[PDB]
Design a protein around this ligand. Structure first.
Ligand SMILES: O=C(O)CCCc1ccccc1
Ligand SMILES: [Zn+2]
Ligand SMILES: [Zn+2]
Lengths: 699, 137, 731
């Protein structure tokens, strides 16, 4: 079963391809409607694979140097193995001398196609956590933020180094634990500083005066964090506070850049409002002028966006080059400037959290899920990840879309046609989790084409680790080319991979026109129809859902940016460009369950026809969980029904990292608008009718 | 939305208490003293004066004038609430000694309450007559 | 008792045994009895020359020396609803006006007749006319702004060298001991800054567990890091500043900061105080080398180098002028062990009406003399009275014109003196000329008036008025000469000549002032003949030429000489004389000829000896009163009764090497010497430490450097000096 195949391979190898059978010719490679691409999750969790505490064996060919994998032809008699990528034959290392066909190494069993190695050589670096705290916010928000940071302090490893930077009009770099005095270095939030400048002005396991081990400093930091008060500078009437977000971040970047370059560090910036001063300014300090909107940016009435975006884009590249993660936790009633600051968490592996106030269950719970540990008491985060991809000589890499940065590494696996962050065989991901999902786009230039994913990263323990996933997919049979290709089509994966392309072009500018020309083309090549007969059009069970996924994608808030604020659009797209397949489908097409006396809970269509008066609905947008009560139900048996969705809500309202916003509404309620807009050119029926008219007519 | 505060005896314009911080003060301090000279027993007890980008606000209670200057954008609703807080405190603490002093600024130490009260109005966080001043002068 | 001529070569013992007293102007009995106190106001020539030609003939400088804010026993305070001032020259109604109609009074400085107001009523009995010294309550128009509060900002060097000196510990202890004694009312504010390579502010809030050290590292672009709690109310936040003064000495014990950015720190301290003004106390221990205002190192001279002074930059002068315009005075405490370019650093205090205090080679363990000296000077500095935001005008009768000002201030316009602070230990001097011949008048007057804000927030005017007669005879100009005041004015003139020209010229003009005046006297009368009033003129000028300000062949170092010139420009006349020509007494045989008047105390009054080793005696002990210190020199063959009953020792060899003070033993010899010493230090408000260390072997017995009559290897004796003058007088 091709579905069993797709399920098991994602469960084992954390990957999902648009096509699992690839064009064995040049005449079908160019004529691919949806590119050969893979939704790759480099750190996916699974049923307790054995960690391999020996160095991974590597092919002895300068260019190739692939890792020993189950596709490698071995000869237990001659103690030799032949690399499946370059056909080079290799001698076994001395520790493999006692090898035998009966008892053979893990990396050769097909079960360990995805395997993790541990390299123990160098002394492990401690983790680094740099808190960057806005002080321009109401007392109830600041007090709540203070408690959240004090809580996270109690979860960090005793080895980790911590630093604290607070800011408002000025920037304060706190020197922790200094006896009876408490000091900090104060800087103007008015001019930027470079790392070399910052180093001159400022100055067994390593640590600075500004970055100290948790175990020696936690007591002084929790007292400092407890005494943090709001920015002392008064806010005059009709003014916003002077908030130097852009310079505080460039001081946090520059601080780590000159103290611990090239090692896992987390710059966690907590924002209570927009940058109103200095490089990176988002809006002026006059309350009379509102923060920019999408309408303002289209009519060229946003004089800060481009200059402010450019400032944070250079900070993102500085931090991503140095190997450091930038988080942004933003909570305020107005906008914050996420549109200008998006590249910092986007280019690194940094989180982006968005709420109304730090004094909410939403933020407090979302913030502590950052520090969720696994079955060993270790954070589910990695640092300084390096992704390298070995392909068969027939495969070339166009590029990647997701949280990563190119290492600009040239090799025969690099394609001319680049996509997203392309032109490279290697990418750096400064922060990753078991969820981080990249999209790799490939190009074809017995059977089986092979690809190997090698991910070196720093574990939360400090151990250096190498994840190796080697996959194989059959080459098309020449006498059955498109028929095998059509059967190996993953409509969900290709929908998300095509959505990745559409959003990447939108966020870096029509895009709907490209999306339709590929839907129509896919209908003609793989659909069944008589020419000029729209009613004759059918789709295989392999393709039938693809048009509907395209209907919801082209109307989603990822491409219809208006009716949302720019910070919300950048937040939505931030999380879609990171999630696995299953969660991505939820974002584009929210799941809908119905609850009534007449039967247990059942999923229903995202159509106005599913909104009944005597039925309770549960809509799972990935970003919000909504419970709707029909006009009748709005008023022991009536209790089971009223709390059946609430019970199912709580379960998923905890696994999801960005805790979704919860909504209890009903017919006539104002908040019912969120259900009425995801539900229902115009409707899908009309959309389908217009699509069939063009599929059966000219190509 | 900034400040200059002066409390003076209406009869002779004798300064009683004031408070000023810069980091000009010279021109508007003169106008303030011009006004203290003109004010008498027929003057409006509550008034507001327009001086371009600046605006004077005062009240008069028990022969004592409470004057404040600020940028015209400062809420006139707030300027008078700040003068009432000063007056009730000043009249409670020094109201009975005012008609006997003869030294200028015989209540310099009222400086302290002025500024602690002043900060409770020049920070949105904490939260009659009109005539061009050039006329009265 | 002296209209006689004196042959300086035959006397050679002309210095009297009892203290010198200032001359009495040749004035009518009733006029002189109201004249100003000569301690507060005095003139080089008590008989003013009628013409500039007569003044030029005498070859003596005409000028005034004043100590206007001196602590007084009794001060009349007029609270007049109206200040009576002459309608023309704004002179305050003074005892030396001319009441005629009695409703009209003739101004003694510009001769205009003024109408006495129906507020001043017998108008001549009014206290404004019975007191040459008086304080007025300034009206509302004598102030540019509300009276400023007392603001004290202390700026400490905390570099590696500074921490090694250990000065911070005692300064913080003095502040803790004298916190309630700082002048001011409930409006008093106080702040603190430390600095090394960066500038350290200290916020103090009652809401926080401990003070907060805010460090601005942008040395080229200093700013204020916090708006409220850097300058704090001392009354409200007394507890918070006490914890800081106990914690401050402990914060920098292990410091490796070798450089000091004094310039930017002073710019930081200026910005902090600019809004209000006040007193900035700066404590610096080494050469500033980092940032703006840096000064280059210099190699100290030796006994061999000739007379080949001025600042090396104008940064500190410019910064002082900016402080002056904002009512900020800067007092510099230099406790340096090496050259620090005080000739440039001093500009911060000269042009801001501050005062520099120098403690050469201060060390908490190594230099106990400088430790106790700083403690006693800090006691006086922190508890003496103070006036803020002040100005002083010096008026004199028409025909006399002031052309040069001496002291720590900024001369604002024609004649106006800016005094960001005024302190009771400051002295000023002025030089004048006869711009218009005084044929009309027979008296001329001088009025100084000090407008200032008191520590309690009250504008006050202190006015002193001096009246002198006019003469037209050379001999009459000599009969009224004040030898000490002429010495004081010549010292200030010689300091200016050093900066302006060289030390050689300054030394020459000093010698020429004696030759030219006595040559003029001789040309209007064999030996060296001088009038009685000038019999100490060559003696005091020689003492000037051997003082550390102007000495040549000595091993003196640069900052020592500059600090000696700073004391010339800023000390009152009495302490300039006590420093230049210290009073020497023999104290091992005191007895009853004293002032035993004081109820239960008998104070011995030993005779003043002349400054020569020929007057010493190995058989006795000699105390030298140099004004700021009291060095007690003990002879080798000193008597045994003195050792055991006064020093508390059994022999000369067991007299402790540094002896910080005498014991108070139960002997009448000890009671006598403690009575004489305590009587000496009661004559001044600046407690002078007494170290008997001067001993034969102490090697700190510079005590001999003050024997200005003996010859040294690189200077003339007093008799050699008289011989050189006579050769020049009748050349
Ligand atoms: O211009 C003036 O002289 C009056 C202001 C300065 C001053 C005040 C008091 C005394 C002397 C001088
Ligand atoms: Zn190989
Ligand atoms: Zn006059």
């Amino acid at each position: 079963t091709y579905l069993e195949f797709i399920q098991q391979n994602e469960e084992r190898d954390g990957v999902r391809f648009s096509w699992n059978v690839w064009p064995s010719s040049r005449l079908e490679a160019t004529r691919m409607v949806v590119p050969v691409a893979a939704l790759f999750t480099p750190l996916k969790e699974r049923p307790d694979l054995p960690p391999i505490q020996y160095e991974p064996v590597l092919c002895s060919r300068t260019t190739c140097r692939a890792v020993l994998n189950p596709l490698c032809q071995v000869d237990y008699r001659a103690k030799l193995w032949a690399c499946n990528f370059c056909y080079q034959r290799n001698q076994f290392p001395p520790s493999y001398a006692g090898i035998s066909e009966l008892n053979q190494p893990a990396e050769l069993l097909p079960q360990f196609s995805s395997i993790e190695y541990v390299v123990l050589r160098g002394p492990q670096m401690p983790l680094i956590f740099l808190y960057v705290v806005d002080t321009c916010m109401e007392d109830e928000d600041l007090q709540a933020l203070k408690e959240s940071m004090q809580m996270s302090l109690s979860l960090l490893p005793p080895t980790a180094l911590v630093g604290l930077i607070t800011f408002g009009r000025m920037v304060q770099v706190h020197e922790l634990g200094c006896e009876g005095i408490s000091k900090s270095y104060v800087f103007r939030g008015t001019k930027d500083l470079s790392a070399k400048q910052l180093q001159e002005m400022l100055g067994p396991p390593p640590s600075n005066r500004f970055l100290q081990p948790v175990q020696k400093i936690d007591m002084n930091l929790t007292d400092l964090l407890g005494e943090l008060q709001r920015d002392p500078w008064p806010v005059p009437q009709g003014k916003r506070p002077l908030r130097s977000s852009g310079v505080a971040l460039s001081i946090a970047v520059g601080l780590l850049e000159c103290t611990f370059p090239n090692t896992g560090a987390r710059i966690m910036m907590f924002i209570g409002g927009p940058a109103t001063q200095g490089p990176g300014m988002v809006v002026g300090d006059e309350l009379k002028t509102p923060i920019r909107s999408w309408h303002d940016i289209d009519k060229d009435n946003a004089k800060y966006v481009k200059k402010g975006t450019k400032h944070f884009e250079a900070l993102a590249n500085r931090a991503a080059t140095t190997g450091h993660v930038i988080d942004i936790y933003a909570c305020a009633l107005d906008q914050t400037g996420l549109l200008e600051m998006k590249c910092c968490p986007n280019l690194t592996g940094g989180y982006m959290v968005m709420g109304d106030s730090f004094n909410t269950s939403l933020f407090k719970q979302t913030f502590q899920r950052v520090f969720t540990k696994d079955m060993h008491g270790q954070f589910k985060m990695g640092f300084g990840g390096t992704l390298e991809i070995k392909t068969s000589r027939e495969i070339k890499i166009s590029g990647a879309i997701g949280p990563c940065v190119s290492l600009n590494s040239k090799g025969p696996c690099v394609s001319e046609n680049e996509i997203g962050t392309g032109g490279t065989c290697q990418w750096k991901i400064c922060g990753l989790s078991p969820t981080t999902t990249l999209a790799i786009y490939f190009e074809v230039v017995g059977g089986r084409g092979a690809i190997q994913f090698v991910t070196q990263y720093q574990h939360s323990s400090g151990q250096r680790r190498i994840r190796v996933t080697t996959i194989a997919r059959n080459w098309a049979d020449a006498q059955t080319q498109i028929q095998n290709i059509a059967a190996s089509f993953d409509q969900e994966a290709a929908a998300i991979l095509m959505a990745r392309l559409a959003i990447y072009r939108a966020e870096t500018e029509d895009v709907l026109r490209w999306l339709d020309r590929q839907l129509i083309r896919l209908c003609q090549k793989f659909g069944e129809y008589h020419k000029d007969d729209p009613s004759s059009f059918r789709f295989s069970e392999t393709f039938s859902l693809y048009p509907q996924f395209m209907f919801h994608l082209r109307r989603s808030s990822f491409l219809q940016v208006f009716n949302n604020s720019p910070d919300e659009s950048s937040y939505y797209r931030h999380h879609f460009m990171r999630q696995d397949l299953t969660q991505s489908l939820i974002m584009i097409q929210p799941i809908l369950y119905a609850y009534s006396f007449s039967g247990p809970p059942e999923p229903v269509l995202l159509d106005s026809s599913s909104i009944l008066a005597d039925r309770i609905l549960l809509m799972d947008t990935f970003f919000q969980i909504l419970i709707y009560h029909g006009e009748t139900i709005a008023q022991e048996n009536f209790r089971h029904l009223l709390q059946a969705p609430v019970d199912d809500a709580q379960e998923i309202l905890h696994s999801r990292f960005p805790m979704p916003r919860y909504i209890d509404t009903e017919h006539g309620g104002s908040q019912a608008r969120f259900l009425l807009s995801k539900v229902n050119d115009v409707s899908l029926q009309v959309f389908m009718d217009h699509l069939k008219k063009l599929a059966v007519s000219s190509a | 939305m900034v400040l200059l505060t002066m409390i003076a005896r209406v009869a002779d314009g004798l300064p009683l208490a004031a408070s000023m911080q810069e980091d000009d003060l010279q021109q508007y301090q003169s106008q303030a003293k011009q006004l203290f000279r003109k004010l008498n027993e027929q003057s409006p007890t509550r008034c507001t004066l327009e001086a371009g980008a600046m605006t004077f606000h005062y009240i008069i209670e028990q022969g004592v004038c409470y004057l404040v200057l600020c940028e015209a954008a400062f809420p006139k609703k707030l300027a008078f609430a700040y003068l009432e807080d000063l007056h009730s405190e000043f009249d409670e603490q020094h109201g009975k000694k005012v008609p006997t002093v003869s030294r200028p600024y015989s209540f310099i130490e009222f400086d302290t309450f002025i500024q602690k009260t002043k900060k409770l109005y020049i920070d949105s966080r904490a939260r009659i007559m009109v005539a061009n001043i050039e006329e009265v002068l | 008792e002296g209209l006689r001529v004196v042959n300086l070569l035959q006397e050679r013992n002309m210095l009297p045994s009892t203290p010198l007293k200032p001359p009495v102007p040749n004035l009518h009995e009733d006029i002189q009895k109201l004249n100003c106190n000569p301690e507060l106001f005095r003139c080089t020539l008590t008989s003013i020359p009628q013409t500039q030609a007569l003044l030029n003939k005498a070859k003596l400088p005409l000028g005034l020396l004043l100590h206007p804010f001196k602590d007084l026993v009794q001060l009349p305070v007029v609270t007049s609803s109206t200040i009576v001032r002459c309608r023309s020259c704004r002179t305050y109604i003074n005892p030396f006006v001319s009441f005629l109609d009695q409703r009209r009074w003739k101004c003694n400085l510009c001769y205009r007749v003024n109408d006495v107001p129906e507020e001043f009523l017998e108008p001549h009995r009014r206290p404004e006319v019975q007191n040459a010294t008086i304080e007025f309550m300034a009206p509302s128009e004598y102030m540019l702004r509300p009276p400023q509060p007392p603001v004290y900002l202390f700026v400490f060097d905390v570099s590696h060298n500074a921490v090694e000196t250990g000065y911070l510990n005692s300064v913080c202890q003095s502040l803790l001991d004298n916190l309630d004694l700082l002048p001011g009312n409930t409006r008093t504010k106080i702040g603190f800054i430390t600095f090394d390579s960066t500038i350290h502010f200290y916020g103090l809030q009652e809401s926080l567990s401990q003070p907060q050290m805010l460090i601005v590292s942008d040395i080229e672009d200093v700013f204020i890091p916090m708006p409220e709690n850097l300058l704090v109310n001392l009354n409200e936040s007394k507890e918070l500043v006490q914890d800081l003064l106990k914690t401050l000495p402990q914060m920098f014990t292990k410091t490796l900061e070798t450089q000091s950015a004094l310039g930017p720190a002073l710019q930081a301290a200026f910005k902090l105080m600019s809004p209000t003004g006040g007193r900035m106390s700066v404590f610096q221990t080494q050469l500033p080398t980092l940032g703006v205002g840096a000064l280059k190192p210099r190699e100290e001279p030796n006994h061999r180098s000739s007379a080949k002074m001025t600042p090396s930059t104008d940064f500190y002068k410019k910064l002082a002028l900016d402080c002056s315009g904002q009512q900020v005075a800067v007092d510099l405490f230099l406790l340096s062990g090496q050259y620090s370019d005080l000739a440039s650093l001093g500009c911060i205090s000269r042009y801001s009406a501050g005062s520099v205090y120098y403690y050469p080679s201060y060390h908490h363990q190594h230099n106990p003399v400088q430790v106790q000296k700083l403690q006693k000077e800090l006691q006086r500095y922190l508890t003496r009275k103070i006036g803020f935001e002040a100005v002083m005008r010096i008026r004199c009768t028409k025909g006399l014109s002031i052309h040069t000002f001496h002291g720590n201030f900024f001369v604002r316009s024609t004649d106006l003196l800016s005094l960001p602070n005024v302190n009771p230990d400051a002295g000023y001097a002025v030089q004048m000329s006869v711009e218009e011949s005084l044929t009309d008048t027979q008296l001329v007057s001088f009025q100084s008036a000090l407008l200032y804000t008191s520590s309690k927030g009250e504008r006050r005017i202190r006015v002193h008025t001096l009246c002198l007669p006019v003469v037209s005879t050379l001999n009459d100009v000599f009969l009224g000469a004040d030898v000490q005041a002429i010495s004081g004015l010549l010292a200030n003139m010689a300091v200016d000549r050093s900066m302006t020209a060289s030390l050689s010229d300054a030394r020459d003009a000093l010698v020429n002032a004696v030759i030219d005046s006595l040559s003029a006297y001789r040309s209007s009368v064999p030996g060296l003949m001088v009038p009685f009033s000038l019999r100490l003129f060559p003696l005091f000028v020689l003492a000037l030429l051997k003082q550390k300000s102007f000495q040549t062949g000595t091993n003196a170092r640069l900052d020592e000489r500059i600090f000696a010139m700073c004391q010339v420009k800023n000390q009152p006349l009495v302490y300039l004389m006590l420093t230049t020509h210290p009073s020497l007494y023999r104290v091992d045989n005191l007895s009853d000829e004293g002032a035993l008047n004081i109820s239960d105390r008998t104070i011995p009054q030993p005779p003043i000896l002349q400054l020569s080793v020929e007057k010493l005696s190995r058989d006795g002990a000699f105390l030298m009163d140099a004004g700021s210190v009291l060095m007690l020199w003990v002879g080798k063959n000193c008597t045994q009764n003195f050792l055991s009953q006064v020093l508390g020792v059994q022999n000369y060899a067991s007299i402790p090497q540094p002896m910080t003070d005498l014991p108070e033993l139960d002997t009448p010899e000890s009671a006598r010497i403690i009575a004489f010493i305590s009587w000496l230090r009661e004559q001044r408000p600046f407690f002078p430490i007494l170290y008997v260390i001067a001993d034969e072997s102490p090697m700190k017995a510079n005590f001999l450097q003050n024997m200005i009559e003996d010859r040294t290897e690189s200077a003339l004796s007093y008799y050699e000096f008289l011989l050189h003058i006579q050769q020049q007088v009748n050349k």
